[PDB]
């Protein structure tokens, strides 16, 4: 039985979102998301770098432990989103985890379709390793499309004989490009956050004709064996619930140490609304603890 903050939030999201079924230009969507992006806390500091040909920032909250890093892979359907749209939540994750985060501006579709984002994520993880960061001091985290891409980067890295990080935290991941999961209807009406055709257009654009079941496009179909300990966050009120429930079971089957938390009443990447959502704040804290626990073990 729900908190007033998530209830005032859902209404605002319903009010401010584009009516269903309506088809918005890509560059309007890109600009929309840029332009309402939260501003990072004033005590977050940032450093521009280029990694594997991409723009990135090191995002450093206070408390950052020397020698630790998180590779962060932002959300946005694989077609939008940027360093700017995610700096605020990654800042808070850096805060809870006491580790600096590398926030990658990875290649976006449709200008760069799949596997470009995966090539970039793996190339960044490699670069982290060429910098000196030890695998046991690493973590990878990502929301939505960034959440799938986390798993995809691991399968791919692993497949290329790269050593796995200490932990991985997909947040509301999209790990099944087919979008055929039951929670797409059972959960439709409770979710203010995601429409498709909306989400289907994104997959169409990312894939550009490629197998929707490719392990690296959709890791719910991947051989997950060897992957590091996982924590998967998802909200009960998202159409993408089933992605996480199935990812979790996939990881379990494949011998992976996985932990699924389904947050009651929560929406898609409710972490991003931390400035006014007690639950956003709490779940980020939790992402932190998990990282440090696995860096503890």
Radius of gyration of the chain (CA): 17
Strand pairing report for 45-51 and 54-60: antiparallel
Taking the C-alpha atoms of residue 190 and residue 170, their distance in angstroms, rounded to an integer, is 22
Catalytic site positions:
144, 238, 268
Please state, in angstroms and rounded to a whole number, the distance separating the CA atoms of residues 146 and 71: 11
Asked if 53 and 59 count as a contact pair (C-beta separation under 8 A), the reply is no
């Amino acid at each position: 039985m729900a908190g007033p903050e998530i209830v005032k939030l859902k209404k605002i999201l319903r009010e401010k979102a584009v009516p269903p079924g309506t088809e918005v230009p890509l560059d309007v969507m890109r600009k929309g998301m840029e332009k309402v992006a939260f501003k990072a806390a004033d005590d977050i500091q940032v450093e521009q770098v280029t990694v594997a040909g991409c723009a990135a920032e090191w995002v450093r909250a206070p408390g950052c432990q020397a020698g630790k890093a998180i590779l962060y892979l932002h959300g946005g359907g694989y077609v939008m989103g940027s360093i700017n749209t995610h700096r605020s939540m990654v800042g808070e994750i850096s805060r809870a985890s006491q580790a600096a985060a590398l926030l990658l501006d990875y290649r976006l579709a449709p200008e760069h379709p799949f596997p470009a984002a995966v090539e970039d994520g793996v190339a960044a993880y490699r670069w982290l390793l060429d910098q000196g960061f030890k695998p046991q001091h690493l973590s990878i985290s990502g929301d939505s499309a960034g959440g799938g891409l986390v798993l995809a980067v691991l399968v791919s890295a692993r497949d290329q004989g790269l050593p796995m990080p200490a932990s991985a935290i997909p947040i509301s991941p999209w790990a099944d490009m087919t979008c055929t999961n039951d929670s797409f209807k059972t959960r439709a009406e409770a979710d203010p956050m995601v429409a498709p055709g909306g989400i289907n257009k994104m997959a169409a654009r990312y894939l550009n004709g490629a197998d929707a079941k490719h392990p690296y496009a959709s890791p719910n179909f991947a051989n997950l064996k060897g992957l590091p300990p996982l924590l998967i966050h998802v909200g009960r009120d998202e159409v993408l619930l089933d992605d996480s429930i199935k990812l979790d079971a996939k990881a379990k089957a494949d011998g992976v140490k996985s932990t699924l938390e389904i947050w009651d009443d929560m929406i898609h990447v409710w972490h991003a609304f931390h400035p006014m959502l007690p639950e956003g704040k709490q779940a980020i804290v939790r992402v932190g603890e998990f990282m440090r626990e696995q860096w503890a073990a």
